Structure formats: C-alpha cells, structure tokens
Amino acid sequence: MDDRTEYDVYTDGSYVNGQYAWAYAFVKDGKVHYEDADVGKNPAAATMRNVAGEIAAALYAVKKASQLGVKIRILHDYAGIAFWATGEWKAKNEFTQAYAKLMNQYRGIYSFEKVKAHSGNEFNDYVDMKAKSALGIRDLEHHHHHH
Template structure:
C-alpha cells in the first residue's frame, strides 16, 4: 500500500482488529476511525479503485460473514486522547514495516 501512505496505517489497523476478533472467537467489534474511507470503502459507499482499497473491501466482505463490525466515527484533530494515540501507533507501524 505504498501509494496510500496517508490511510494505509488505518486500513491495516482495522484489518488487524478484525482478524484478532476472528482468531479469538470474539463475535463483535467496534472500529473507531477518523478517516471516512475506513467505513465507506468497506461498505461499498466509496468506489475502491486502488489496490489497497480493493483488498480492504474484499477482506471486509469475507470477515463480515463471521464478525459483526460496528464503525464508529471520531472527529479528526480534535484532541481525542485515544484517536491521537491510534494515529501515532498507525504511523509508527507503517514506518517500521516500510523499513524492514
């Protein structure tokens, strides 16, 4: 997802949370996001026209068969403590994976 650096971390974080729930038999998850694409690509509201968004939509379509996913919008850049932490972790994870 090199061409989607601005949202790649959020997409990967969402996928990891969904995978964690599937692997641990957790039936439902709340995905908090600040970038609308996280929900809109998954639900088919926005067109998926890049490799990363296509793969994310396909992943969501498979996972939703076994997991109830609730998308929860959080306002970006609003000093939300947990959103700020998530943004920092997503950037760190993306940076670390690109240096492997």
C-alpha cells in the first residue's frame, strides 16, 4: 500500500569471497515486509569487479518499489551512487552506463542525479550506517557534515 521510510536503502556494497550480490530493505505500512538478497553468476556481471552487483540492488529495488506502491529515498538521497555521479569518467567506461538507462525504464517512483559511468570506492558502504537508521537501531548524539 504505502510506506513511511526516510533513510537510504540497504543497497550497493556486498559480496562473498569474490562474487557479487545485490540486497535491499523492503517496508510496507511502515514496517518490515520482506528481507532477502540475491547473488549472480554471469561473467558480464562477475567481471566488473563485482561492481554491477552493488548498483544492481538499486535497480531491482525500484522495479519492485512500483509493485509495493511505495517509494525509496529520493529527497536529496545522493547515497554512494551520487559519488561517481559527479562525473569521474566517461559514460563509455565500464557497463555502469546501463544504470542511467535502466533509470527511465522504471523511473517514476524513485529519484536520483546524473550518473555517467565508472566507479570504485567505499561511497556505497555508506549505506551501511545510513540503513542502520532505517533497520532499527538506538543511539544518542547530534552531529553531521556537508559535501
């Protein structure tokens, strides 16, 4: 039906030994509805340094997002994806380009900035701490930064 989240989704940044996997957090009615990841095997996706898997999540995340009639972080989400989205390398570089294409494919529930291609960093791992806020963790502090 709907949701009430306000934190980045658990996507981008995951692998076992040397493979690539994509995961995400689902919530319905403002509560945990689903919970499960998925691994690949294909070479085209297992040859991009397991990068295709990190972004992969954001892909399937939107596709299903339309099924649950819900939406993901869009309000200045940024996330790790917005890291390379600034334009670090030509769009041709790597198959990451497909990402920008898959956007319009299911664009209407989520939002994001311009993502050319190429990548390589821990910008995705950031979702680890962010997602923690959505999952359900306690704390007590008041601080932040800007970039």
